[PDB]
């Protein structure tokens, strides 16, 4: 292959997602489970809020809830930092600025625990407007397609990422979430540091009609470029 860790993703890999969140004081925890298939770049997940009802819309948390499952084509596996960081994993820090509303601050650890790919997150949301689009729940239960731009970080043998999410507001228009992401490896061994390249995402949000807990099922498709 191109990296040792890439061989960890040659099969469908089960996923565990854990988030502790806090938004304008509202505390919540989410658990998610599912599997990823990096050779297609497909991910299917079902998250449940385990503390009651999510204080913010589920689409706002999609990008916080696994980029080691991106399908890197053959002529591009030399650019796949995420798998090269494995098994030991990487920290994934992000500051999301929602246009004209508050911010999320998120810290995650993405690593193999056993045979499962685990993304363990802490999220802090501050300065949200009581009736803005987030705390007003004015977003639509859907998700656009995005292009997330990836650059190597030579000083930290990691990657600096920047992209912008489009949250379809119920009134038709778009509420921007501007993501500032930093990925830093947990282990000593070398990593693949990529030439500037894009990741293409597609995401489907739906529900599990025999689960009556606040939940989100996510069908995500990620590919390199």
From Swiss-Prot:
Coiled coil: none annotated. Keywords: Chromophore, Luminescence, Photoprotein. Changing residue 97 to S: In alphaGFP/cycle 3 GFP; improves folding at 37 degrees Celsius, reduces aggregation at high concentrations, and increases the diffusibility of the protein inside cells. Changing residue 161 to A: In GFPB; leads to enhanced fluorescence at 37 degrees Celsius. Changing residue 200 to F: In H9; increases fluorescence at 395 nm excitation. Changing residue 77 to R: In Topaz; shifts the major emission and exitation peak up to 20 nm. Green fluorescent protein has been engineered to produce a vast number of variously colored mutants, fusion proteins, and biosensors. Further generation of mutants led to more stable proteins (at 37 degrees Celsius for example) with brighter fluorescence and longer fluorescence lifetimes. Energy-transfer acceptor. Its role is to transduce the blue chemiluminescence of the protein aequorin into green fluorescent light by energy transfer. Fluoresces in vivo upon receiving energy from the Ca(2+)-activated photoprotein aequorin. This is Green fluorescent protein. Contains a chromophore consisting of modified amino acid residues. Maturation of the chromophore requires nothing other than molecular oxygen. InterPro entries: GFP, GFP-related, Green_fluorescent_prot. It holds the Pfam family GFP. Changing residue 165 to V: In P9; increases fluorescence at 475 nm excitation. In R10-3; matures to the red-emitting state with excitation and emission maxima at 555 and 585 nm, respectively. Belongs to the GFP family. Monomer. The lineage of its organism: Eukaryota, Metazoa, Cnidaria, Hydrozoa, Hydroidolina. Changing residue 47 to L: In mut3.3; shifts fluorescence lifetime from 3.03 to 1.88 ns. In R10-3; matures to the red-emitting state with excitation and emission maxima at 555 and 585 nm, respectively. Gene3D superfamilies: Green fluorescent protein. Changing residue 101 to E: In mut1.27; shifts fluorescence lifetime from 3.03 to 2.85 ns. Changing residue 169 to L: In R10-3; matures to the red-emitting state with excitation and emission maxima at 555 and 585 nm, respectively. Changing residue 148 to I: In Azurite; shifts the excitation and emission spectra to shorter wavelengths and increases quantum yields compared to BFP. Changing residue 222 to R: In Azurite; shifts the excitation and emission spectra to shorter wavelengths and increases quantum yields compared to BFP. It comes from Aequorea victoria. Changing residue 160 to Q: In R10-3; matures to the red-emitting state with excitation and emission maxima at 555 and 585 nm, respectively. Changing residue 144 to I: In ECFP; leads to cyan fluorescence, folds faster and more efficiently at 37 degrees Celsius and has superior solubility and brightness. Photocytes. Changing residue 146 to D: In Cerulean; leads to improved quantum yield, a higher extinction coefficient and is 2.5-fold brighter than ECFP.
């Amino acid at each position: 292959p191109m990296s040792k860790g890439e061989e960890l993703f040659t099969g469908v890999v089960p996923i565990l997602v854990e988030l502790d969140g806090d938004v304008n004081g509202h505390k919540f925890s989410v658990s998610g489970e599912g599997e990823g298939d990096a050779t297609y770049g497909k991910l299917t997940l079902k998250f449940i809020c385990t503390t009651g009802k999510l204080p913010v819309p589920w689409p706002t948390l999609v990008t916080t809830f696994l980029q080691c499952f991106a399908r890197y084509p053959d002529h591009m596996k030399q650019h796949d930092f995420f798998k090269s960081a494995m098994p030991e994993g990487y920290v994934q820090e992000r500051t999301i600025f929602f246009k004209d509303d508050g911010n999320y601050k998120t810290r995650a650890e993405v690593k193999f625990e056993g045979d499962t790919l685990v993304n363990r997150i802490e999220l802090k949301g501050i300065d949200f407007k009581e009736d803005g689009n987030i705390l007003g729940h004015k977003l639509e239960y859907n998700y656009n397609s995005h292009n997330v731009y990836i650059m190597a970080d030579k000083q930290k043998n990691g990657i600096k990422v920047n992209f912008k999410i489009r949250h379809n507001i119920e009134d038709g228009s778009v509420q921007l979430a501007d993501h500032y992401q930093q990925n830093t490896p947990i282990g000593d061994g070398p990593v693949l540091l990529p030439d500037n390249h894009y990741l293409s995402t597609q995401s489907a949000l739906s529900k599990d009609p025999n689960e009556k807990r606040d939940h989100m099922v996510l069908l995500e498709f990620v590919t390199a470029a």
